């Protein structure tokens, strides 16, 4: 409780205030995003073969018994698909072919050669168009106590769907038959650089080829280039098409009208608000000379950029430069067209991840971070401005009760006096509850509670495996155990 004189104290003077941060410069643009192509190349082929079946029948006294049924597929030759099947819708009743290094000849019904009409097969639900010649199997007539042979030749034409995967050196048919030739092989137009596993006399091309439909009989109007390959089981025909305009190893995934591009040091950051994704690329562009069989990219990007620009950015924006290409992390190729508003005109294979969730977690983290740092940056500016503004009131309250102001500022109960700054040295009944009024402004902030995220899947890996009807591993394990369950593979005689 003393006077004052020696020790003197001054108030801190207004502090420099944090400045509103610079802000991010986004380039607006149009983007199309490409992913790895997983779907095979699909094309239409026609199979041309003959079911040849010979039966051996023993004739008892009251019964007859098959002693053997030999079944074989025989290819129709090139001259018969051109001069009989396509010309007249007909097929010769004789199969002449090479099976086991021998020319075998089979006559239908063991009768002389006849041209037999191809007629539509019986209707099945999810099948394609097929045509055949005979409905019945020929068996020999009964004469007693003999073995007799009987031959059936059924000429079958069916239109099948064909599938090929990268590097497009083979293709499959819907029957399950591998063809070890590229779909794009040929003798014309530089197509001989492709892969074939067959001898050259098995493959022919026909220009000016006119399909005659086996049902309607109408010859086609536009000619085609017809490939024809004679495999040892069948002849397949398909229309030739060049490889590069018909194959792309990269598939269009998303078209986005509003793609913002930002600078992230050594990298670009490409964000979408519609997809709620953001991708990270390098600043240097990806060259389209690096993508193997990638001719679809620049064509499908340019077709989608100008369609979006004429529906969204026609009179409000202008393009800047040509389309730019960037390889994002996770295996996404982003084609990007930069834009600018009308008020401001002064080889390898890309492998794409199955999960895009890193880009959606990157969007949602950045969209919260930018809001929280903006709002808390304003509270930091407004707090420094308010504390520098209350010094005016502290300089006037100091001259009224110096004892109370120096005790609130120094830290301990201090008696005070001034000369230009504070000189300061250290220092009934009852009625505890009088009516009270608050000079305080309340502020009730609560905490964000702890949340727990459980594992959640819509379909598990076990549910996706048994979604199909037939498991090939499970059917081959059951069928190869047939001898071990019903026979004796050990005992002789």
């Amino acid at each position, epitope marked *: 409780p003393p006077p004052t004189g020696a020790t003197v104290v001054q108030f801190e003077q207004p502090r420099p205030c944090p400045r509103a941060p610079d802000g991010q410069n986004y380039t607006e643009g149009i983007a199309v995003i490409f992913k790895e192509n997983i779907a095979p190349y699909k094309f239409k082929a026609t199979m041309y073969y003959k079911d040849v079946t010979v039966s051996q029948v023993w004739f008892g006294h009251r019964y007859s018994q098959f002693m053997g049924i030999f079944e074989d597929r025989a290819p129709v030759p*090139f001259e018969e698909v051109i*001069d009989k099947i396509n010309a007249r819708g007909v097929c010769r009743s004789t199969a002449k072919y090479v099976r086991n290094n021998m020319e075998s000849t089979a006559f239908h019904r063991d009768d002389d050669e006849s041209d037999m009409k191809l007629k539509p097969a019986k209707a099945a639900t999810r099948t394609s168009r097929g045509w055949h010649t005979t409905d019945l199997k020929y068996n020999p007539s009964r004469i007693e106590a003999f073995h007799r042979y009987g031959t059936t030749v059924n000429c079958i034409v069916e239109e099948v769907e064909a599938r090929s995967v990268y590097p497009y050196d083979e293709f499959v048919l819907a029957t399950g038959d591998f063809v070890y030739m590229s779909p794009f092989y040929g*003798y*014309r*137009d*530089g197509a001989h650089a492709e892969h074939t596993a067959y001898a*050259a*006399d098995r493959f022919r091309q026909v220009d000016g080829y006119y399909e005659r439909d086996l049902s309607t009989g109408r010859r086609a109007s536009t000619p085609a280039t017809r490939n024809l390959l004679t495999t040892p089981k069948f002849t397949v025909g398909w229309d030739w098409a060049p490889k590069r305009p018909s194959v792309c190893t990269l598939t269009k995934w998303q078209e986005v009208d509003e793609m913002l591009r930002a600078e992230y040091g050594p990298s670009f950051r490409f964000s979408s608000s519609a997809l709620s994704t953001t991708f990270t690329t390098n600043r240097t562009e990806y060259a389209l000379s690096r993508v193997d069989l990638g001719d679809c990219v620049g064509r499908e990007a340019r077709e989608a950029v100008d369609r979006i620009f004429l529906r969204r950015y026609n009179g409000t924006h202008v393009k800047v430069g040509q389309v730019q290409y960037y390889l994002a992390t996770g295996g996404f190729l982003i084609a990007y067209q930069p834009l600018l508003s009308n008020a401001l005109v002064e080889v390898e294979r890309i492998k794409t991840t199955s999960s895009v969730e890193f880009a959606r977690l990157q969007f949602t983290y950045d969209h919260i971070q930018r809001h929280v740092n903006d709002m808390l940056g304003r509270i930091a500016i407004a707090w420094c401005e308010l504390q520098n503004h209350e010094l005016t009131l502290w300089n006037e309250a100091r001259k009224l009760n110096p004892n109370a102001i120096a005790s609130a500022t120094v830290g301990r109960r201090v008696s005070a006096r001034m000369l230009g700054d504070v000189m300061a040295v250290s220092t009934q009944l009852g009625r505890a509850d009088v009516t009270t009024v608050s000079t305080f402004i309340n502020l009730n902030l609560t905490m964000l509670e702890d949340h727990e995220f459980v594992p959640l899947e819509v379909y598990t890996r076990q549910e996706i495996k048994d979604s199909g009807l037939l498991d090939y591993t499970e059917v081959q394990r059951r069928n190869q155990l047939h001898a071990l369950r019903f026979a004796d593979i050990d005992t002789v005689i």
Partner: antibody
Amino acid sequence: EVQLQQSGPELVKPGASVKISCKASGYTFADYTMHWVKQSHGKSLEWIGYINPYSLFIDSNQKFKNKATLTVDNSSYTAYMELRSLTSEDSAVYYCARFPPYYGFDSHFDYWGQGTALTVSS
Amino acid sequence: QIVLSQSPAILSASPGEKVTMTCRASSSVSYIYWYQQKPESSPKPWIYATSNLASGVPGRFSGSGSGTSYSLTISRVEAEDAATYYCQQWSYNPYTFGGGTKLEIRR
């Protein structure tokens, strides 16, 4: 034996039109294409085009898209070639040649006509 | 428009020795063909499918090659071999022939 009998010599004025015939015998005419080649004096062989007598499909050289048109008389088994707007550079020997109606390793010009000497002068 | 550059344009050969021709193509062709022509006569098929001999040509003739490089060899040249030999392609439109090699014999 396979024989391709061709028209013969023909002198022709400039601007006129001429029609060369190639007659076939010894083989079935409908399942072989019929080609035409040009050989100028002291020069090499230039291809013109062909025609399939069965399908009337015509593939041709685009250097001769205004000069040559091709047609087939199915009854007489003869192939024709009509040269239009004859200038001086059309003076050459023209041959007709047999070729398969497909493309394989075998598909070559196995039989040739004797030629026709065509002179555009006055 | 496949040019078929063919060398040498003239080839002298004493009867009995082996000689060779060349046919270079501007791009790769599936097969090269060969045709001989004697003066005031039609061309004749000589070698098809780059190696297969035609109907009635002697066994002293042989061909080889693939892609853009092709050759025509004679094992022991005779006096009846003096002709003009054309290489030919049909892989692109239009069909094109070569300029021609001419065998002279040195008696």
